[PDB]
C-alpha cells in the first residue's frame, strides 16, 4: 500500500511575477523539489534513490514545472476576476494530484484537487468522471471543464503514467521505501514539585509517520499531552506523549507504542 | 514524474 503525490503552490506577489513551488512525495518521503525563486530554477533530488536519474529526467521535469507556472499565472488572473478581487491582493492557488496503489501494485485511487486562498475550490471525484465545486466561482471552472471533457483527459496520467512512476520509484528505493524503521523509545521523568511529576514517552527516528502512543495507569487508558508528529530532519519522525502523575505513583503507569516497524507492540515504564 | 499536462482554472 503506497502512494505518490505532487503538491504545487502558486502565489501572486503584485509588484514583486508569481512564485511557483512544487514538491513530490512517495509515501512519507519527499523526493523532488522545484522553486521558481531559486538561483537557476530546476527540479532537484531530495531522496537518495532518485539521484540515479539521468539528465533527460531532470530537464523534462524542469520544463513541465516552468510551463505549469505560466498556466497558474493565467489561472490566478481568472480567479481574481471570478471573485472581483482588486489587482492589489496576493493570492494562493494550490494543486495536489497523484495515485494510491494497493499491496498488489494495482491502482487503488486517483487524486486531483485544488484550493484557492487556503479553501477547497474544485476536486475530481473518486469516480474520476465528475467534479465537486466548492462555490459558484468554482462552478465556472466546473462548467468549462465539463465542456472540454477534462476528467477523461486526466485519466491517462492518473490511471496509467502515475502508477508506472510510483512502481519505478518503489523498485529504485526498495531499501528505504519498502522497509519501516521502528521507533527508538524511552521514558523520561520531570519533577513539577515534591508532589507531582511529568512522565514523557518518546518515540524517535521512526518511519513511516503513522504511530500510536498511549499512556495506561494500572492498564487503564489515560485519554495525556500529545504533540503533533514532527520531522527529525533525516526523513524519520518523532512524537511524544506525556502525563502528569503524583510523585511515587510513577510505577503505576505504562506507555504503549504501536508502529509498522515493530514486530510486536511495545510497553515501557519509568524505571 | 509530474504529469505532462496543462490546464487553466
Amino acid at each position: 500500500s503506497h502512494s505518490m503525490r505532487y503538491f504545487y503552490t502558486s502565489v501572486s506577489r503584485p509588484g514583486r511575477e508569481p512564485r511557483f513551488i512544487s514538491v513530490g512525495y512517495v509515501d512519507d518521503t519527499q523526493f523532488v523539489r522545484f522553486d521558481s525563486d531559486a538561483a537557476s530554477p530546476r527540479e532537484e533530488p531530495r531522496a537518495p534513490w532518485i539521484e540515479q536519474e539521468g539528465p533527460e529526467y531532470w530537464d523534462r521535469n524542469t520544463q513541465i514545472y516552468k510551463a505549469q507556472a505560466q498556466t497558474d499565472r493565467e489561472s490566478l488572473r481568472n480567479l481574481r476576476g471570478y471573485y472581483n478581487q482588486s489587482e492589489a491582493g496576493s493570492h494562493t492557488l494550490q494543486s495536489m494530484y497523484g495515485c494510491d496503489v494497493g499491496p498488489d501494485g494495482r491502482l487503488l485511487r486517483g487524486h486531483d484537487q485544488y484550493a484557492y486562498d487556503g479553501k477547497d475550490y474544485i476536486a475530481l471525484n473518486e469516480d474520476l468522471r465528475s467534479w465537486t465545486a466548492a462555490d459558484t466561482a468554482a462552478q465556472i471552472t466546473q462548467r468549462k471543464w465539463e465542456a472540454a471533457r477534462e476528467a477523461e483527459q486526466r485519466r491517462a496520467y492518473l490511471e496509467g503514467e502515475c502508477v508506472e512512476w510510483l512502481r519505478r520509484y518503489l523498485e529504485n528505493g526498495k531499501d528505504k521505501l519498502e522497509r519501516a524503521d521502528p521507533p527508538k523509545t524511552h521514558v523520561t521523568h520531570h519533577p513539577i514539585s515534591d508532589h507531582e511529576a511529568t512522565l514523557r514517552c518518546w518515540a524517535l527516528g521512526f518511519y513511516p509517520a503513522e504511530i500510536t502512543l498511549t499512556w495506561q495507569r494500572d492498564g487503564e487508558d489515560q485519554t495525556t499531552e500529545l504533540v503533533e508528529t514532527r520531522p527529525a530532519g533525516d526523513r524519520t519522525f518523532q512524537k511524544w506523549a506525556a502525563v502528569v502523575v503524583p510523585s511515587g505513583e510513577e510505577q503505576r503507569y505504562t506507555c504503549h507504542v504501536q508502529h509498522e516497524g515493530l514486530p510486536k507492540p511495545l510497553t515501557l515504564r519509568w524505571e | 514524474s509530474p504529469r505532462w499536462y496543462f490546464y487553466y482554472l
Partner: T-cell receptor
Framework: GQQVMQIPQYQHVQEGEDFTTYCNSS?????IQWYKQRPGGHPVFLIQ?????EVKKQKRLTFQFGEAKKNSSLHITATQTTDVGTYFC???????????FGTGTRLKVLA | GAGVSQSPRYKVAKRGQDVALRCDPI?????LFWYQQALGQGPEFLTY????????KSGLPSDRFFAERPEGSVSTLKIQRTQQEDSAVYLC??????????FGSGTRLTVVE
C-alpha cells in the same frame, strides 16, 4: 527502436459487414489513441484507452487494448458508407513529447 | 481561435525554392507539433514546442527543415531549397501537453520541376 504498425493496408467491405484494424507497437505503451480521417480530410480523434485489457464502445465502434499494452484494435459492426476513410492509431509512451501514428487502414464500403 | 489554423492550404513550389508554412494553434495551447504526412500514409513526427522552446527536434529530416515559434503562439515551418521528396501534407497540432491533441487541416505542398 520503436515502430508502430497497422494492418491491413486497406479493406473493401460490403455495407452492413464488419471491419477491423489492428495496431501493434514494438515497445510498451502508456496509452493508445484512435483517429478517423474522412476522405480528403485530416485525422480527428475518436477515443483513448489507458488500461491493459480495456474495452470501450462508442456507437458502432468497439476499441480494445491488449494485456501487455503493445496492441490495440478498432472494430466497426455494420459498416455504413459514411464510415469510409482511413483509421489511424497513435501510441504515447511516458517520458516523451510525441504521439506516434500507425500506418493506417483505409476502409472502402461497397454499397 | 477555437481550432488550429494553417496557411497556405495549398502550395506549389519550384524545386530549389524555399517555403514557409504557418500555423496558428488553439488559443492558450502550450504545446505545438509539426507532422509530415505523405499521400495515402500516416502522420510522422517532425518537431515539438512547449511555449517558445523547441524541446524535441528529433523528427526533422535534415538541416533544410527548421521550425520557429518566437512568441510561443504562431509557428513557422521553413523548408529550404525544396526537393521533390518534400511533397506532402504538413500537419500542425496543438495541445495542453498530453491533453487536447488536435490537428489543423494541413498545408498541401507539391514541389514541381
Amino acid at each position: 527502436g520503436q515502430q508502430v504498425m497497422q494492418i491491413p493496408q486497406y479493406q473493401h467491405v460490403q455495407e452492413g459487414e464488419d471491419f477491423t484494424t489492428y495496431c501493434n507497437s514494438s515497445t510498451t505503451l502508456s496509452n493508445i489513441q484512435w483517429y478517423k480521417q474522412r476522405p480528403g480530410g485530416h485525422p480527428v480523434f475518436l477515443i483513448q484507452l489507458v488500461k491493459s485489457g480495456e474495452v470501450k464502445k462508442q456507437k458502432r465502434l468497439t476499441f480494445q487494448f491488449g494485456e501487455a499494452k503493445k496492441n490495440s484494435s478498432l472494430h466497426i459492426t455494420a459498416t455504413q458508407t459514411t464510415d469510409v476513410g482511413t483509421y489511424f492509431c497513435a501510441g504515447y509512451t511516458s517520458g516523451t513529447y510525441k504521439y506516434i501514428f500507425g500506418t493506417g487502414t483505409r476502409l472502402k464500403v461497397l454499397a | 481561435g477555437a481550432g488550429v489554423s494553417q496557411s497556405p492550404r495549398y502550395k506549389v513550389a519550384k524545386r530549389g525554392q524555399d517555403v514557409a508554412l504557418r500555423c496558428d494553434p488553439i488559443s492558450g495551447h502550450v504545446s505545438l507539433f509539426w507532422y509530415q504526412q505523405a499521400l495515402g500514409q500516416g502522420p510522422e513526427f517532425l518537431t515539438y514546442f512547449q511555449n517558445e522552446a523547441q524541446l524535441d527536434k528529433s523528427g526533422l529530416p535534415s538541416d533544410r527543415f527548421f521550425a520557429e515559434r518566437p512568441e510561443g503562439s504562431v509557428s513557422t515551418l521553413k523548408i529550404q531549397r525544396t526537393q521533390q521528396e518534400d511533397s506532402a501534407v504538413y500537419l500542425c497540432a496543438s495541445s495542453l501537453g498530453q491533453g487536447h491533441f488536435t490537428f489543423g487541416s494541413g498545408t498541401r505542398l507539391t514541389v514541381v520541376e
